[model samples]
Target chain A: MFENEILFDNGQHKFMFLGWQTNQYLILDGNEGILLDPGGAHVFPRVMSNVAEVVDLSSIRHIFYTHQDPDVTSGILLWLSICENAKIYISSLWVRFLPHFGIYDQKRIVPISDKGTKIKLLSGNELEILPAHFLHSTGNFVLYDPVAKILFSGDIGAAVFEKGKRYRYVDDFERHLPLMEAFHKRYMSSNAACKKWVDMVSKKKIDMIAPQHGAVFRGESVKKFLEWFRNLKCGVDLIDNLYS
Target chain B: FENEILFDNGQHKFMFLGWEEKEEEIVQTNQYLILDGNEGILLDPGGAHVFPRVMSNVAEVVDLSSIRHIFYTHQDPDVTSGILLWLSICENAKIYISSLWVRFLPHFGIYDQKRIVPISDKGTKIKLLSGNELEILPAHFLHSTGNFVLYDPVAKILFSGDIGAAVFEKGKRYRYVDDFERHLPLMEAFHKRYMSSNAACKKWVDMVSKKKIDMIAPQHGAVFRGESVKKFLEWFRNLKCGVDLIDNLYS
Candidate 1:
């Protein structure tokens, strides 16, 4: 019942928001493709079907996990088994936890440093990995696509929708703020880290802000979200008494 | 993909999932869910690759936490790789698997023993919240040495593990086997290669034939109903498989 859609396509370099829940992003640069947050084992089949519709599953050469949460990386084995040539790019901090999910191949895993690095695609365009440490995950990294001008902002702008309620793009930022506010307040690290992330992406030219769990923030909404997130008090900032 | 309801009475409902157009690496594995009264049980929950869809589909009918029981027909990864994920979501859910594979559960990242119920080689009965008993019948060496099949007495439906499983071509995978004769070829090669012996097949067919079975829902391929049920049993009873074909395979 879930349908995939292309958020942006420029013939050669395309950005696709695949399937429904647990937002998966497919970025195609010529014949090579990069999949961001392929999602848990449960959504792999639908995601695979969505990816197959655009390019051959084998064409996906790099699989990126923003962090090591099961929602972002549990389906590593399924992707590894099918894609054959693909290598996984995840934060080095979470590399030790891969064994818990049945992944042990060091040859297939490409661990990213906390400083973040850019991965060059077959088409020679570089997908810059921006440091997003402690925004939620301690070693998180959000991918920046220079060509699409879209920031694949992992869980940074994530919104938790009510069951069975979803939208492709955030039509009204004011109406969508409630869905995103509580999640950020509870899950995000603190205001310091939030402002750091905002400052990092502020300099970048972004047309769309696509997160892992919510609707897309486009055009003016991208600017509005960054400004709002820059001052939000969350996680440690909201904590009072754990003993209580 | 959506789940299909196989049989439903007022108090109990049986649902089938895992009939999607899949690639070769995504092995064809079927998952069944039974919602009885206030409780639900998931059969062969399959690997982690299919759990999200299964959970979403399962939630469509019953609460995710309400599914208090999970069944793994055997120890195969395709049948139980998502064991950790299932247990985490359904907090009160207990796992039921053959005792032979209970020790192997740790390799699948499962270590807790409190919630896991090991079925004996002689088989046992599971009591549902609706005061009905589902029989766990022994079907050793059908494929796995510790294999077991579940029988729901209320619906007269047998969740026949891999006993009647078939390997269908891409587009030929249908929900039910309408033509028994045509479906045999799809099943033949798999049974010959995977099934242990002709004796094991005969023994299982004999034990199952005595039951008042209306349907045979296997873990792979199609479900068998009405005439297809009896035809499958008779066909499998005399089939020469595994050890029986030693000469042909050896030479």
Candidate 2:
């Protein structure tokens, strides 16, 4: 019943979108739609139902899962059942382990390498999949939309539960910073590659920052969020000092 | 009176005037009054001092053996203690209680194999010589292992077991509601803390609520009537809220 659709008209094309409590994006451009991480299993029915209002359910040509976590992958099974022609895409590192988690059918999965290849989405949008640096999952990726100035971050800037809504953005950067910092410390600690990924996205004109979990941040707050993200402590060693 | 023996010389009369009590401590003795022939059988005669007083009274009216059935509410001391003394004197008296109590009787060392007739909750009906019909209502798992309440529809009295209790001095055998509040706390403590939480307590309360309880002569405490007995039941249902510290025997 709750609908969230973002229509992005980039002069030539229009993209009707669907996102989750987390920042997974499902952009419908014309006849074909490209869905990012599909959120949790519970969110799938509503997500599909919301998408159904805009376009046909079968129009989703490709479903690109950011990681192998249940939040990102649980809905793909249901989506696959409905979207018959939809091809599943995931990082190659998770492909071998996917079957262990009950996602056994290998025929639908398209595993991308670490070098980061450009994915020609059926939506006609060119998504440059870059290896997510020192982030949460081992094989995480960021889908960058150059024209839309959007970065579909897998788990970066992810907040657990924000007043039960589960999403936040740039304008609420300060509110979400503590949550993101806590998540990074708890889940993603290795910071060796964080700076590199920060540098890669910093060069682009990021109008909107879409994370796998929690809201999308835009405008000046996006830059501030990235700066705050980079400034986070990234060592594998945990710091026990609590400043009360 | 049919067959009666005097207790404490000669004080009060004993008649199995079957009646039920709502609360527990009141039914401590499982005692009831035994009336004259054709009246009814008062199974367990429970009162603060009525056992000695009532037994004395019954001796003047009739012989103890002709009283027909000697029914016990349960195998508790108050309920069976009088029976122990009565069985020795009454020759033809058959003690009736739940069959389950038969196994439990050995614990008290008062197992009368011949006299203690184990009756099911679904017992037969008997018409007294006084035209009063005595019905044994099946009170399965009412309180203890196996217990039942005897209903005398003719006299409108129910012989309830240890379902109700009140605080009464040995001298003052009469029950007053104002006096109950002082004793209610003691009964509440025993029921919640001492007794293990089981379906028996709930079943007893439910069974007693449906019946028309006129005079509640419990085993331990004073007799209650009207709203006073109703208030006791309300206390039982809502005891969980007041009594926070529950006794867990198994734990």
Which predicted model would earn the best lDDT?
A: 1
lDDT of 1 by residue, B172-245 (tens): 56788889999888788889988989999999999989999989999887899979999999999999999898
Each model's DockQ score: 0.02, 0.00
iRMSD of all candidate structures: 11.5, 37.4
Clashing pairs for predicted structure model 1, backbone only = A42-B52
Fraction of native A-B contacts kept, per candidate: 0.00, 0.00
Distance (Å) between predicted and true CA of B196, model 1? Answer: 1.5
Q: For each candidate, what is the lDDT? A: 0.82, 0.60
Q: Report how far residue B72 has shifted in candidate 1, in Å.
A: 1.2
Provide the TM-score for each candidate, comma-separated: 0.53, 0.45
lDDT of 2 by residue, B1-251 (tens): 23322112132233332222332333334345555443325566542234544555455455554666676666655445455445543545666777766777544334335666778766656555555456776655434556666765544555555556644443434433445576675466556653334444555667667877655555555555657677777766555421244333334
Task: Point out where model 2 deviates above 4 Å.
Answer: A11-24, A101-104, A122-124, A161-168, A235-244, B1-251
Runs of candidate 1 exceeding 4 Å displacement = A1-244, B22-27
